[PDB]
Amino acid sequence: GSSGSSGKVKWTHEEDEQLRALVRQFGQQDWKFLASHFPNRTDQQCQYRWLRVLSGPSSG
């Protein structure tokens, strides 16, 4: 990030957990694929929500 703040699409302990596991599952490296798991979500939203939420020692 840099300037601005705004994140669309909602996320619950479900997706987060899913994506979280999905990451370790094979590797976050392949988001385009991970997003596949989520027909409602996408690589961007995923990666984003990750690099936005699922990113750091303390989830904020």
The domain ranges of the chain are: 1-60
Report d(CA 30, CA 23) in Å as an integer. 8
Q: What is the largest CA-CA distance in the chain?
A: 32
Q: Which residue has the tokens 């929500």?
A: 49
Using the CB atoms, write b or e for 4-41: b if 16+ within 10 Å.
Answer: eeeeeeebeeebeebbbebbeeeebeebeebbeebeeb
